[PDB]
Write a protein that binds this ligand. Structure first.
Ligand SMILES: O=C(O)/C=C/c1ccccc1B(O)O
Length: 264
């Protein structure tokens, strides 16, 4: 029997679906795991790894991040509030990346995906940092279908956390690019009711949300800095068996609380 797991099992049973959790305390090496190696749909949470892949490319292409992109209306997608606002202005690669991370801007995400060689190009970047689980197969908005048993556009909580650690705290990006990725995540506007709701107000947090909507499917991953202590990296993913099952932000926050409590 697994006593650590029992509160997570109770939470997912009340939710009416499955919750996947992985958390790492980078100071002690302690972990918390619940369904940590199961696949869950990425939804918009791929956009954080997208921005990291762009930062990696910018290391060897001088001025890439500073480059303005002047897209047309044909590039717009529902829920692209920054791309629409700057349609008559244009946006730099850095501004598109920040919009994808911090507002989940769909047009910005698809524009950057195209620059990288599409979903396959992002998947190849994730392979290059040692992530063998991540796969992106489709673009916005098709990638949100979240069909039970479909492995397209999925990863695991453990692989998400491991890759997030490499990119925000490890050596997968050069230091100026690692710092920019952290700065973008810290400025996220979409996650105030998820992992951020589970951490003390005085701690620093960078996160990226995802919401497929269908099949009760939504998620959040984050790097968390308790004041003066080594950071924690964690991921919380959900899904449910029926198409019209509703996702829950409160369940994600409650799972994040249990993860922080279970760490040594
Ligand atoms: O960031 C989120 O939680 C939701 C972003 C979003 C919004 C509209 C359509 C698709 C997505 B995403 O999850 O792919």
């Amino acid at each position: 029997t697994n006593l650590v797991a029992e509160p997570f099992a109770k939470l997912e049973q009340d939710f009416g679906g499955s919750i996947g959790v992985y958390a790492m305390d980078t100071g002690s090496g302690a972990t918390v795991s619940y369904r940590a190696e199961e696949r869950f749909p990425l939804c918009s949470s791929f956009k954080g790894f997208l921005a990291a892949a762009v930062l990696a490319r910018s290391q060897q292409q001088a001025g890439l991040l500073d480059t303005p992109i002047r897209y047309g209306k044909n590039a717009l997608v529902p829920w692209s509030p920054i791309s629409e606002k700057y349609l008559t202005t244009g946006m730099t690669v850095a501004e598109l990346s920040a919009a994808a991370v911090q507002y989940s801007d769909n047009a910005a995400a698809n524009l950057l995906l195209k620059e990288l060689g599409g979903p396959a190009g992002l998947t190849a970047f994730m392979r290059s940092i040692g992530d063998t689980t991540f796969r992106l197969d489709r673009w916005e908005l098709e990638l949100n279908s979240a069909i039970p048993g479909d492995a397209r556009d999925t990863s695991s909580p453990r692989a998400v956390t491991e890759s997030l650690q490499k990119l925000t705290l490890g050596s997968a990006l050069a230091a100026p690019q690692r710092q920019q990725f952290v700065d973008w995540l810290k400025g996220n506007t979409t996650g105030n009711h998820r992992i951020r709701a589970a951490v003390p107000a005085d701690w620093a947090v960078g996160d990226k949300t995802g919401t497929c909507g269908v099949y009760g499917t939504a998620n959040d991953y984050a790097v968390v800095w308790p004041t003066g202590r080594a950071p924690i990296v964690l991921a919380v993913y959900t899904r449910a068996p029926n198409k019209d099952d509703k996702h829950s932000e409160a369940v994600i926050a409650a799972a994040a609380r249990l993860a922080l409590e279970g760490l040594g």
